[PDB]
Design a binder for this molecule. Structure first.
Ligand SMILES: [Mg+2]
Ligand SMILES: [Zn+2]
Length: 320
């Protein structure tokens, strides 16, 4: 059931070359991929090559994988191909600034998990799917969409000539799929709260130990949240435009809820737009700021994400 790219598509990617001007910009946390749509697949290739090495994956398999991933994202307002590449770019910036803290297997796994983290999203929340007994909610009792996204990731790797992980030892192969599974599951914001609280405690008591697998899993989980929410770390006009896409998706869900006779939550109600700035302020205070604060404590080089998030918080305050 997984879509396949065309030969023309992956061969096009193989020949793509990244303009020199962008090489310096892509390294920055605040970089916005927005104006370079045609370059998105090539930007990912470039990031994999810079982080993992030009020989880490067989170029042909990597290009097929990327173009098929693109094909498996829907034309929804927010949880689409653009969001996947944006999240992958933030991961790249985090990894580049903390390079040696992560294994080569983790870097490959995380960049891939980010590209795939919202695969085949339908524009509906786990709350909606569960409330209206969608087949997916029956299959996946908790972290509904996230379990689906990982299932889709595996489905793509199984496609002819798409298994970029085939050269890994049987042990490393199982390890990378676990890194990916955990990383994708971690993008369920419901799990973020507990993870952040635990990490803050470990950090403050000085018990945090990155050679402890369970601790690494938690740090990786917080990195996933940080990447997933990164629109809040861009330049204000970019942050503002992305919020428009987020809300366009939310309001469409809210519209469906009204048809089913249920009044939607304010965030999904298109008739409550004037309350958006307060809603944003609330989210930054309760979710975004704590996320980047704990991430900065654990990985000091990620401080520019927290600074940018704080600047945007100030912008929402100006709106109010
Ligand atoms: Mg998601
Ligand atoms: Zn996402």
């Amino acid at each position: 059931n997984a879509s396949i790219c065309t030969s023309e598509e992956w061969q096009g990617l193989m020949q793509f070359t990244l303009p020199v001007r962008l090489c310096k910009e892509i390294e920055l946390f605040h970089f916005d991929i927005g104006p370079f749509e045609n370059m998105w697949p090539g930007i990912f290739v470039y990031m994999v090559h810079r982080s993992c090495g030009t020989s880490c994956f067989e170029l042909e398999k990597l290009c097929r994988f990327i173009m098929s991933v693109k094909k498996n994202y829907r034309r929804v307002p927010y949880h689409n191909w653009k969001h996947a590449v944006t999240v992958a770019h933030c991961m790249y910036a985090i990894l580049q600034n903390n390079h040696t803290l992560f294994t080569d297997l983790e870097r490959k796994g995380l960049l891939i998990a980010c590209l795939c983290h919202d695969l085949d999203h339908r524009g509906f929340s786990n709350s909606y799917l569960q409330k209206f007994d969608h087949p997916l909610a029956a299959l996946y009792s908790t972290s509904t969409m996230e379990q689906h996204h990982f299932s889709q990731t595996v489905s793509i790797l199984q496609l002819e000539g798409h298994n970029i992980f085939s050269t890994l030892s049987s042990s490393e192969y199982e390890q990378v799929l676990e890194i990916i599974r955990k990383a994708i599951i971690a993008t369920d914001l419901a799990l973020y709260f507990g993870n952040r609280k635990q990490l803050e405690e470990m950090y403050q008591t000085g018990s945090l130990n990155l050679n402890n697998q369970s601790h690494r899993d938690r740090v990786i989980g917080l990195m996933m949240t940080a990447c997933d929410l990164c629109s809040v770390t861009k330049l204000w006009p970019v942050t503002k435009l992305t919020a428009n896409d987020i809300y366009a998706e939310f309001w469409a869900e809210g519209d469906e809820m009204k048809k089913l006779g249920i009044q939607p939550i304010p965030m999904m109600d298109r008739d409550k737009k004037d309350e958006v700035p307060q809603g944003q302020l609330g989210f930054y205070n309760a979710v975004a700021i704590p996320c980047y604060t704990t991430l900065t404590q654990i990985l000091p080089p990620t401080e520019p994400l927290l600074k940018a998030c704080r600047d945007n918080l100030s912008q929402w305050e100006k709106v109010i």
